[PDB]
Short mmCIF file of C-alpha atoms and ligand atoms in Angstrom, two decimals:
data_model
loop_
_atom_site.label_atom_id
_atom_site.label_comp_id
_atom_site.label_asym_id
_atom_site.label_seq_id
_atom_site.Cartn_x
_atom_site.Cartn_y
_atom_site.Cartn_z
CA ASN A 28 -7.67 94.69 98.03
CA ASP A 29 -7.54 92.19 95.22
CA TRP A 30 -7.03 88.56 95.87
CA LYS A 31 -4.38 88.25 93.13
CA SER A 32 -1.75 88.68 95.60
CA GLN A 33 -2.73 85.55 97.38
CA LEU A 34 -1.80 83.40 94.40
CA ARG A 35 1.54 81.49 94.68
CA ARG A 36 3.51 82.30 91.47
CA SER A 37 6.97 80.91 90.67
CA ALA A 38 9.50 83.48 91.58
CA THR A 39 11.77 82.97 88.44
CA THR A 40 8.97 83.35 85.91
CA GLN A 41 6.28 85.08 87.74
CA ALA A 42 3.81 82.56 86.27
CA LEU A 43 1.11 80.82 88.47
CA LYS A 44 1.97 77.39 89.88
CA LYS A 45 -0.33 74.45 89.00
CA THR A 46 -0.96 74.11 92.79
CA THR A 47 -3.93 73.10 94.74
CA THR A 48 -4.06 76.37 96.88
CA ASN A 49 -3.98 78.54 93.63
CA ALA A 50 -6.92 76.53 92.40
CA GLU A 51 -8.68 76.94 95.72
CA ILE A 52 -8.16 80.71 95.79
CA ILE A 53 -9.35 80.96 92.18
CA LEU A 54 -12.44 78.89 92.90
CA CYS A 55 -13.23 80.72 96.08
CA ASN A 56 -12.56 84.21 94.67
CA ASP A 57 -13.43 84.35 90.97
CA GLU A 58 -16.71 86.00 90.23
CA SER A 59 -17.71 83.52 87.59
CA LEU A 60 -16.79 80.57 89.70
CA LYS A 61 -17.61 81.96 93.24
CA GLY A 62 -19.54 79.34 95.22
CA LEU A 63 -21.49 77.37 92.57
CA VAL A 64 -20.74 73.91 94.02
CA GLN A 65 -22.02 72.19 97.19
CA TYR A 66 -22.09 68.76 98.54
CA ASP A 67 -25.23 66.73 98.80
CA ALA A 68 -24.33 64.80 101.80
CA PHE A 69 -27.29 62.32 101.66
CA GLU A 70 -26.79 61.62 98.00
CA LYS A 71 -23.03 61.87 98.51
CA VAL A 72 -22.69 63.97 95.26
CA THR A 73 -21.63 67.38 94.07
CA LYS A 74 -24.72 69.64 93.25
CA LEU A 75 -24.76 73.19 91.94
CA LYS A 76 -25.62 75.97 94.23
CA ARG A 77 -26.50 78.01 91.06
CA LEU A 78 -26.40 77.68 87.25
CA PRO A 79 -23.01 78.52 85.91
CA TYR A 80 -22.65 80.93 83.04
CA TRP A 81 -21.92 78.00 80.60
CA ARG A 82 -25.24 76.31 80.98
CA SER A 83 -28.61 77.06 79.33
CA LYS A 84 -31.10 79.01 81.39
CA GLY A 85 -33.59 76.22 81.82
CA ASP A 86 -31.43 73.09 81.89
CA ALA A 87 -32.61 72.08 85.25
CA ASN A 88 -29.78 69.66 85.81
CA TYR A 89 -28.21 70.69 89.19
CA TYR A 90 -25.53 67.92 89.28
CA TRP A 91 -21.90 68.60 88.58
CA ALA A 92 -20.62 66.80 85.47
CA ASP A 93 -17.45 66.30 83.51
CA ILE A 94 -18.18 69.17 81.06
CA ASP A 95 -18.60 71.60 84.08
CA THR A 96 -14.99 70.59 84.91
CA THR A 97 -14.03 71.17 81.39
CA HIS A 98 -15.56 74.69 81.38
CA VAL A 99 -13.93 75.45 84.76
CA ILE A 100 -10.51 74.52 83.43
CA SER A 101 -10.99 76.50 80.27
CA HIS A 102 -12.25 79.51 82.15
CA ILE A 103 -9.43 79.47 84.73
CA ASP A 104 -6.80 79.12 81.90
CA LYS A 105 -8.49 81.84 79.70
CA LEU A 106 -8.49 84.43 82.48
CA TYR A 107 -5.31 83.20 84.25
CA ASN A 108 -2.45 81.88 82.20
CA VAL A 109 -2.44 78.62 84.18
CA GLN A 110 -3.44 75.19 82.76
CA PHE A 111 -4.78 72.98 85.58
CA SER A 112 -4.93 69.26 85.20
CA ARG A 113 -8.45 67.70 85.29
CA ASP A 114 -7.64 65.59 88.39
CA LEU A 115 -6.50 68.67 90.22
CA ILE A 116 -9.58 70.63 89.34
CA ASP A 117 -11.87 67.63 90.30
CA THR A 118 -10.11 67.42 93.65
CA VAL A 119 -10.49 71.15 94.36
CA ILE A 120 -14.07 71.04 93.27
CA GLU A 121 -14.73 68.01 95.63
CA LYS A 122 -13.12 69.85 98.44
CA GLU A 123 -14.95 73.01 97.90
CA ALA A 124 -18.30 71.27 97.63
CA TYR A 125 -17.53 69.20 100.87
CA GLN A 126 -16.87 72.56 102.65
CA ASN A 127 -20.30 73.84 101.51
CA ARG A 128 -22.02 70.61 102.43
CA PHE A 129 -25.73 70.24 103.28
CA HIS A 130 -28.25 67.66 104.01
CA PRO A 131 -31.64 68.08 102.38
CA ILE A 132 -33.50 65.48 104.51
CA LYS A 133 -31.92 66.82 107.63
CA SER A 134 -32.98 70.18 106.46
CA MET A 135 -36.62 69.10 105.79
CA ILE A 136 -36.91 67.21 109.19
CA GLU A 137 -35.64 70.36 111.00
CA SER A 138 -37.20 72.84 108.59
CA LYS A 139 -40.03 73.32 111.20
CA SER A 140 -40.48 72.23 114.78
CA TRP A 141 -43.20 69.82 115.90
CA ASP A 142 -46.35 71.18 117.49
CA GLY A 143 -48.43 68.76 119.63
CA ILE A 144 -50.77 67.00 117.14
CA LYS A 145 -49.88 63.24 117.37
CA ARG A 146 -49.75 62.43 113.75
CA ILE A 147 -47.01 59.70 113.81
CA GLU A 148 -49.41 56.98 115.26
CA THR A 149 -52.22 57.45 112.81
CA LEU A 150 -50.16 57.33 109.62
CA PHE A 151 -51.64 54.35 107.69
CA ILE A 152 -54.79 54.19 109.84
CA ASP A 153 -56.56 57.30 108.67
CA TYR A 154 -54.94 57.49 105.27
CA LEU A 155 -54.99 53.93 104.08
CA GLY A 156 -57.96 52.77 106.15
CA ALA A 157 -55.97 50.59 108.49
CA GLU A 158 -57.30 49.38 111.94
CA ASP A 159 -57.18 51.71 114.93
CA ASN A 160 -55.21 48.95 116.70
CA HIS A 161 -52.30 49.21 119.16
CA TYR A 162 -50.09 47.08 116.91
CA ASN A 163 -50.78 49.42 113.89
CA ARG A 164 -50.13 52.55 115.77
CA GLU A 165 -46.96 51.15 117.61
CA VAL A 166 -45.41 49.65 114.36
CA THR A 167 -46.15 52.92 112.24
CA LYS A 168 -44.67 54.95 115.03
CA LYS A 169 -41.54 52.79 115.20
CA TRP A 170 -41.20 52.85 111.44
CA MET A 171 -41.21 56.62 111.36
CA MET A 172 -38.66 56.64 114.23
CA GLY A 173 -36.56 54.21 112.28
CA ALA A 174 -36.73 56.34 109.10
CA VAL A 175 -35.56 59.52 110.97
CA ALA A 176 -33.05 57.42 112.91
CA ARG A 177 -31.54 55.99 109.73
CA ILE A 178 -31.37 59.63 108.57
CA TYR A 179 -29.77 60.88 111.83
CA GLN A 180 -27.87 57.82 113.08
CA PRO A 181 -27.02 56.42 109.61
CA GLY A 182 -25.52 53.06 110.35
CA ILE A 183 -28.20 51.62 112.77
CA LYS A 184 -29.81 48.22 113.41
CA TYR A 185 -33.37 48.46 111.98
CA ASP A 186 -34.41 45.23 110.13
CA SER A 187 -38.04 45.65 110.45
CA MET A 188 -40.20 46.36 107.35
CA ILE A 189 -43.85 47.62 107.17
CA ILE A 190 -45.78 45.70 104.51
CA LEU A 191 -49.09 47.21 103.32
CA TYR A 192 -51.80 44.84 102.06
CA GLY A 193 -54.70 46.22 100.02
CA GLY A 194 -56.60 46.32 96.81
CA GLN A 195 -55.38 47.66 93.36
CA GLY A 196 -56.12 51.38 94.26
CA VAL A 197 -56.10 51.84 98.10
CA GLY A 198 -53.26 54.44 97.50
CA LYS A 199 -50.59 52.57 99.46
CA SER A 200 -47.81 53.28 96.69
CA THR A 201 -49.17 56.88 96.54
CA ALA A 202 -48.89 57.16 100.28
CA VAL A 203 -45.51 55.79 100.30
CA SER A 204 -44.37 58.11 97.51
CA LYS A 205 -45.80 61.14 99.39
CA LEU A 206 -43.82 60.18 102.51
CA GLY A 207 -40.73 59.70 100.42
CA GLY A 208 -40.76 62.83 98.44
CA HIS A 209 -37.83 63.33 96.25
CA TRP A 210 -35.85 60.64 97.91
CA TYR A 211 -38.62 58.00 97.65
CA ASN A 212 -37.46 55.01 95.54
CA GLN A 213 -39.14 52.03 93.70
CA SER A 214 -36.59 51.18 91.01
CA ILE A 215 -35.29 48.21 92.98
CA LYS A 216 -36.38 44.90 91.76
CA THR A 217 -33.48 42.48 92.41
CA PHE A 218 -31.91 42.32 95.83
CA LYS A 219 -28.85 40.08 95.53
CA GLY A 220 -25.48 41.10 94.09
CA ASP A 221 -23.16 44.08 94.46
CA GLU A 222 -24.58 46.77 92.03
CA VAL A 223 -27.72 46.84 94.14
CA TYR A 224 -26.01 48.89 96.73
CA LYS A 225 -25.32 51.55 94.13
CA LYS A 226 -28.99 52.03 93.59
CA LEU A 227 -29.48 53.10 97.10
CA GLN A 228 -27.32 56.21 96.90
CA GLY A 229 -29.92 58.93 96.69
CA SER A 230 -32.81 56.94 98.07
CA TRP A 231 -34.30 57.38 101.54
CA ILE A 232 -37.57 55.40 101.59
CA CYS A 233 -37.27 52.36 99.30
CA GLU A 234 -40.50 50.63 98.43
CA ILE A 235 -40.67 46.97 97.23
CA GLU A 236 -43.87 46.38 95.33
CA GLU A 237 -45.14 42.81 94.95
CA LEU A 238 -47.61 42.70 91.93
CA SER A 239 -47.27 38.99 91.43
CA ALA A 240 -46.35 36.50 94.12
CA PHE A 241 -42.65 36.64 94.88
CA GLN A 242 -40.58 33.39 94.44
CA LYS A 243 -39.20 31.67 97.42
CA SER A 244 -35.68 33.14 96.67
CA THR A 245 -36.85 36.70 96.42
CA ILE A 246 -38.19 36.68 100.05
CA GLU A 247 -34.75 35.53 101.33
CA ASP A 248 -33.12 38.11 99.03
CA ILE A 249 -35.19 40.99 100.66
CA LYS A 250 -34.43 39.54 104.10
CA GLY A 251 -30.71 39.62 103.52
CA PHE A 252 -30.93 43.02 101.83
CA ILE A 253 -32.84 44.90 104.49
CA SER A 254 -30.75 43.04 107.18
CA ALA A 255 -27.67 44.93 106.02
CA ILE A 256 -26.45 48.09 107.76
CA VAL A 257 -23.44 48.82 105.58
CA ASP A 258 -22.59 49.11 101.88
CA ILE A 259 -19.09 48.92 100.23
CA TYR A 260 -18.38 50.78 96.96
CA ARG A 261 -15.18 51.67 95.19
CA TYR A 262 -11.25 55.94 93.26
CA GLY A 263 -9.47 54.67 96.44
CA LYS A 264 -9.65 53.83 100.11
CA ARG A 265 -12.50 51.53 99.21
CA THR A 266 -14.96 54.27 100.16
CA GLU A 267 -17.20 52.12 102.36
CA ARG A 268 -20.52 53.88 102.11
CA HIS A 269 -21.26 53.00 105.76
CA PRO A 270 -24.37 55.09 106.41
CA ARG A 271 -27.17 53.14 104.70
CA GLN A 272 -29.88 55.69 105.43
CA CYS A 273 -32.50 53.65 103.55
CA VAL A 274 -35.72 52.46 105.26
CA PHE A 275 -37.80 49.96 103.49
CA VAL A 276 -41.58 49.55 103.02
CA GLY A 277 -43.35 46.78 101.00
CA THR A 278 -46.66 46.98 99.16
CA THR A 279 -48.19 43.56 98.45
CA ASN A 280 -51.33 42.68 96.47
CA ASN A 281 -51.82 39.02 97.75
CA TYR A 282 -53.16 38.57 101.08
CA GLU A 283 -50.91 35.67 102.03
CA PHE A 284 -47.38 36.82 101.19
CA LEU A 285 -45.47 35.16 104.08
CA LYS A 286 -44.16 31.62 103.35
CA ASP A 287 -41.10 30.91 105.51
CA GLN A 288 -41.26 30.91 109.32
CA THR A 289 -37.75 32.53 109.18
CA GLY A 290 -39.07 35.69 107.64
CA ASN A 291 -41.54 36.35 110.54
CA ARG A 292 -40.91 38.69 113.46
CA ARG A 293 -39.25 41.03 110.93
CA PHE A 294 -42.05 41.75 108.38
CA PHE A 295 -44.82 43.61 110.03
CA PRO A 296 -47.98 43.42 107.85
CA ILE A 297 -50.67 46.12 107.99
CA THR A 298 -54.05 45.43 106.39
CA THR A 299 -55.29 48.50 104.58
CA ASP A 300 -58.98 48.87 103.57
CA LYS A 301 -60.91 51.42 101.49
CA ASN A 302 -63.99 53.56 102.21
CA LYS A 303 -62.84 53.82 105.81
CA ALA A 304 -59.74 56.10 105.35
CA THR A 305 -60.44 59.41 106.97
CA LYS A 306 -58.11 61.22 104.83
CA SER A 307 -57.29 60.68 101.16
CA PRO A 308 -53.70 59.92 100.52
CA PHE A 309 -53.94 61.68 97.03
CA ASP A 310 -54.88 64.97 98.54
CA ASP A 311 -54.14 65.15 102.33
CA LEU A 312 -50.55 63.85 102.41
CA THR A 313 -48.87 67.26 101.79
CA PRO A 314 -45.21 68.11 102.29
CA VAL A 315 -46.18 70.19 105.21
CA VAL A 316 -47.94 67.30 107.02
CA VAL A 317 -45.31 64.72 106.37
CA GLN A 318 -42.62 67.17 107.43
CA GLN A 319 -44.54 67.65 110.68
CA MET A 320 -44.81 63.88 111.05
CA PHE A 321 -41.09 63.45 110.52
CA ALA A 322 -40.32 66.33 113.12
CA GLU A 323 -42.61 64.42 115.63
CA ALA A 324 -40.62 61.17 114.79
CA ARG A 325 -37.47 63.18 115.42
CA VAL A 326 -38.72 64.24 118.95
CA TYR A 327 -39.73 60.70 119.90
CA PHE A 328 -36.50 59.14 118.67
CA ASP A 329 -34.30 61.85 120.13
CA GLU A 330 -36.11 61.06 123.64
CA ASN A 331 -33.98 57.89 123.35
CA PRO A 332 -31.45 57.77 120.52
CA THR A 333 -30.89 54.09 120.43
CA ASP A 334 -31.62 51.05 118.26
CA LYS A 335 -33.32 49.45 121.18
CA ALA A 336 -35.80 52.39 121.07
CA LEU A 337 -36.89 51.24 117.55
CA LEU A 338 -38.02 47.92 118.70
CA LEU A 339 -41.72 47.27 119.41
CA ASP A 340 -43.52 47.06 122.80
CA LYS A 341 -43.53 43.68 124.38
CA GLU A 342 -47.28 43.12 124.00
CA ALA A 343 -47.07 44.80 120.63
CA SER A 344 -44.52 42.29 119.54
CA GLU A 345 -46.50 39.32 120.97
CA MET A 346 -49.55 40.34 118.99
CA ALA A 347 -47.40 41.14 116.00
CA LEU A 348 -46.78 37.33 116.19
CA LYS A 349 -50.52 36.78 115.85
CA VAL A 350 -50.70 39.16 112.75
CA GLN A 351 -47.77 37.40 111.16
CA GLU A 352 -49.46 34.07 111.68
CA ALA A 353 -52.63 35.40 110.24
CA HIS A 354 -50.77 36.59 107.09
CA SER A 355 -48.79 33.37 106.50
CA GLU A 356 -49.60 30.11 104.51
CA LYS A 357 -51.30 27.56 106.74
CA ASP A 358 -49.96 24.16 105.08
CA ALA A 359 -53.42 22.78 105.80
CA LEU A 360 -51.99 19.41 106.88
CA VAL A 361 -51.72 19.78 110.71
CA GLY A 362 -55.56 19.99 110.88
CA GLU A 363 -55.99 16.76 108.90
CA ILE A 364 -53.45 14.99 111.13
CA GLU A 365 -55.16 16.38 114.21
CA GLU A 366 -58.43 14.88 112.93
CA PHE A 367 -56.73 11.45 112.40
CA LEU A 368 -55.37 11.57 115.91
CA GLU A 369 -58.59 12.54 117.48
CA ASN B 26 14.98 71.79 117.61
CA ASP B 27 11.78 72.75 115.80
CA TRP B 28 10.57 69.96 113.72
CA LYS B 29 10.30 72.23 110.59
CA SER B 30 14.11 72.25 110.59
CA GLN B 31 14.06 68.47 109.89
CA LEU B 32 12.38 68.99 106.57
CA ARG B 33 14.68 68.11 103.60
CA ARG B 34 14.76 71.29 101.54
CA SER B 35 16.27 71.43 98.09
CA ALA B 36 19.50 73.45 98.80
CA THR B 37 19.69 74.84 95.20
CA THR B 38 15.99 76.43 95.09
CA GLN B 39 15.22 76.43 98.87
CA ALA B 40 12.02 74.66 98.28
CA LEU B 41 10.75 71.39 99.93
CA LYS B 42 11.06 68.32 97.76
CA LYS B 43 8.21 65.94 97.32
CA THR B 44 9.91 63.13 99.21
CA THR B 45 8.53 60.55 101.51
CA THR B 46 10.51 61.73 104.39
CA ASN B 47 9.08 65.25 104.21
CA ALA B 48 5.53 63.84 104.08
CA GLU B 49 6.26 61.49 107.06
CA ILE B 50 7.76 64.37 109.12
CA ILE B 51 4.81 66.63 108.38
CA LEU B 52 2.22 64.10 109.24
CA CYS B 53 4.07 62.96 112.38
CA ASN B 54 4.61 66.57 113.56
CA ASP B 55 1.61 68.46 112.45
CA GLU B 56 -1.08 69.15 115.17
CA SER B 57 -3.88 68.98 112.60
CA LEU B 58 -2.49 65.64 111.34
CA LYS B 59 -0.74 64.16 114.37
CA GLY B 60 -1.71 60.45 114.60
CA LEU B 61 -5.33 60.48 113.18
CA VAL B 62 -5.13 56.96 111.45
CA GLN B 63 -4.83 53.38 112.48
CA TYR B 64 -4.88 49.95 110.87
CA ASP B 65 -7.55 47.45 111.66
CA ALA B 66 -5.82 43.99 111.50
CA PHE B 67 -9.11 42.03 111.45
CA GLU B 68 -10.82 43.92 108.58
CA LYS B 69 -7.88 45.07 106.48
CA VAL B 70 -8.78 48.79 106.41
CA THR B 71 -7.44 52.02 107.61
CA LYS B 72 -9.73 53.76 110.28
CA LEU B 73 -9.68 57.06 112.09
CA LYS B 74 -8.14 57.21 115.60
CA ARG B 75 -9.70 60.64 116.04
CA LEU B 76 -11.90 63.19 114.17
CA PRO B 77 -10.03 65.53 111.79
CA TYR B 78 -10.81 69.10 111.90
CA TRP B 79 -12.45 69.09 108.48
CA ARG B 80 -15.22 66.66 109.49
CA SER B 81 -18.51 67.46 111.19
CA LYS B 82 -18.55 66.89 114.87
CA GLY B 83 -21.47 64.58 114.74
CA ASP B 84 -19.97 62.27 112.15
CA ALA B 85 -19.47 58.82 113.71
CA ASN B 86 -17.85 57.63 110.53
CA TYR B 87 -14.35 56.25 111.06
CA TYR B 88 -13.29 55.09 107.67
CA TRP B 89 -10.47 57.04 105.94
CA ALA B 90 -11.95 58.13 102.56
CA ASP B 91 -10.53 60.00 99.53
CA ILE B 92 -11.78 63.28 100.80
CA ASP B 93 -9.63 62.92 103.86
CA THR B 94 -6.63 62.48 101.58
CA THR B 95 -7.85 65.51 99.57
CA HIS B 96 -7.95 67.62 102.69
CA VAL B 97 -4.54 66.32 103.93
CA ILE B 98 -3.06 67.21 100.66
CA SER B 99 -4.70 70.66 100.63
CA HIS B 100 -3.71 71.49 104.17
CA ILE B 101 -0.13 70.39 103.60
CA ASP B 102 0.05 72.61 100.56
CA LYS B 103 -1.55 75.53 102.34
CA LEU B 104 1.01 75.36 105.23
CA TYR B 105 4.10 74.34 103.46
CA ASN B 106 3.49 74.81 99.73
CA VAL B 107 4.76 71.31 98.64
CA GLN B 108 1.95 69.79 96.64
CA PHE B 109 2.52 66.26 97.49
CA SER B 110 1.08 63.66 95.02
CA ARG B 111 -2.20 61.82 95.77
CA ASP B 112 -0.40 58.39 95.61
CA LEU B 113 2.45 59.59 97.77
CA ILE B 114 0.15 60.85 100.47
CA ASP B 115 -1.95 57.55 100.32
CA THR B 116 1.24 55.65 100.81
CA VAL B 117 2.49 57.77 103.75
CA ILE B 118 -1.08 57.58 105.43
CA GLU B 119 -1.01 53.80 104.97
CA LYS B 120 2.49 53.48 106.43
CA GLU B 121 1.50 55.71 109.37
CA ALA B 122 -1.70 53.66 110.02
CA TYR B 123 0.39 50.52 109.93
CA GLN B 124 2.79 52.05 112.46
CA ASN B 125 -0.36 52.26 114.66
CA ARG B 126 -2.08 48.94 113.69
CA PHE B 127 -4.31 47.23 116.02
CA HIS B 128 -6.44 44.13 116.24
CA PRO B 129 -10.04 45.09 117.39
CA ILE B 130 -11.10 41.77 118.83
CA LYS B 131 -7.64 41.10 120.45
N1 AGS C 20 -56.94 61.34 92.26
C1 AGS C 20 -56.44 60.31 91.86
N2 AGS C 20 -54.96 60.31 91.79
C2 AGS C 20 -54.34 59.20 91.60
N3 AGS C 20 -54.76 57.93 91.61
C3 AGS C 20 -56.13 57.98 91.80
C4 AGS C 20 -56.97 58.99 92.04
N4 AGS C 20 -58.23 58.57 92.18
C5 AGS C 20 -58.16 57.28 92.05
N5 AGS C 20 -56.87 56.89 91.91
C6 AGS C 20 -56.62 55.38 91.64
O1 AGS C 20 -55.81 55.06 92.89
C7 AGS C 20 -54.76 54.14 92.46
C8 AGS C 20 -53.39 54.68 92.93
O2 AGS C 20 -52.67 53.56 93.45
P1 AGS C 20 -51.11 53.45 93.26
O3 AGS C 20 -50.44 54.26 94.39
O4 AGS C 20 -50.73 53.82 91.82
O5 AGS C 20 -50.79 51.84 93.35
P2 AGS C 20 -51.30 51.03 94.66
O6 AGS C 20 -52.46 51.98 95.14
O7 AGS C 20 -50.23 50.73 95.59
O8 AGS C 20 -52.06 49.77 94.04
P3 AGS C 20 -51.06 48.58 93.60
O9 AGS C 20 -51.73 47.21 94.03
O10 AGS C 20 -49.78 48.73 94.33
S1 AGS C 20 -50.82 48.56 91.67
C9 AGS C 20 -54.83 53.86 91.04
O11 AGS C 20 -55.57 52.65 90.75
C10 AGS C 20 -55.65 55.12 90.50
O12 AGS C 20 -56.44 54.81 89.35
#
C-alpha cells in the first residue's frame, strides 16, 4: 500500500501540514530522496549514501551542503504541495542521517580480524630503521593501542607522543600518512587558541612536523594541546565535542629537540635510520597491513580497556628516561663546574 | 487519571496547543522521556541522567546536544502531533534539568 496515507494532513483543507513527521515520512519513503544521507560519526558530519539526482555524475563531493537542502525543499514542494522551512528540513535531514550513522575508522579496524603475526611491536623498527629495542617495541605498541583506544574510548587520558627523528628522506612522514589514511592530518601548525579544536574534526592521526627548530613557546603549546581530552565548540547546547579521538605523532629534523625538563616523560623519541629498514614505507605500508596492525592493537587494548593499560612498562619508562635525556640539550655548564670543584 | 487527560487541548479544534504546560506534562509523563536530564551546578551544563533510546548503547557521552532536542521534538510530534518549537523544547528541557540539578563534587 502507498505511504501517502501516513501523511498527516489538515482535516479542514486536506493539505499537508508543515510538520516534522510529514517530512520524515517523505524523506524515508520518496524514491528520489530515499536513504541518501548518513551520519559520519567520526567526522560528526552528514555524508551522502549516494549521489542525488541533482548532482553531476562525477562531482565526488559526498558531503551534504546547503544547496542539497535547497533541492530537497524544492523537490518536496514540487511533488507534494507543502512548503517546508529550511530549518525543519535541516533538522529532519540531521535526524535521518543520525539514524543511519556509521563510523569509518571503527569499520576499518573491525573490517577484518587479526591473525597471529605480531606486527604492532615492529612498526617503526623495520619500516623506518629504528632499533630493535624493548623501549621502541613497547612505545610503538602503546602508541597503536592509544590510537585505537582514542577511537573506541574517545575521551581517554593519553598524553604521550611518539616523536620520530631522522634525515630528510627516511620516510617518517610517509609512514605516518600511510598509517593515518584518509584521517591523517598535518595541517595543524599553531596549537594555542580556540579555532584549533575545529581543525581536529575529521582527523585521527595528527602529525606535527618540525622542519626548523620550534621556539620555546611552541613546545609548551603542543604540550598543552596534546594534554587535553575534550573540546568545546558551538547552534545550541554548547555542543561539547567531548570525544577527542586524535592521537598525535611528531616528526623532527633536529637531533636535539627537547629543551625543557617539563616536556620530558611525555615525549617519547625514536631514532630512525636508513639502509637498515627491512620494509620500505613507500611500498610495504599498504592498507591491508595497517588494518591488521590496528586490529592487533584493538585486541591488545581490549584485553584491558583502561588508560592505565596505555602507560609504558616500569623498566620501559625508566629507560625512556635515559632516551629523553639523550635527546635533550645538555647546558654544558655542570661539567665545567664539576671540573672546577674537582 | 491517565496523564494524557491532563494535556490542555484547544476546545475549539480538539488539537493540543503548543504551550509550556503541555511540553512539561509530556516530558514528565513519557516513558521515553521520563527524567533523562539533570543540571551540573559546578560546570553550568545540562547532562544526561540516563541514556535515551535514540543513542547507541556504547555511547559514554552524557552531554545533552542539539540532536537530543531534535529527537525529543520528533518523538513528541510522532506520538502527539503537536510540533513544539525548538526554543520551547530547549526551555522545557532546561527547566526539567534545573528541577533535578545537582552539584557533582558536593
Ligand atoms: N618512491 C618514493 N616515493 C616517495 N618518496 C620517495 C621515494 N623514493 C624516495 N623518496 C624520498 O623520500 C622522502 C619522503 O619523505 P617525506 O615523507 O616526504 O618527508 P620526511 O621523510 O618526513 O622527511 P622530512 O625531514 O620530514 S621533510 C622524500 O625526500 C622523497 O624524495
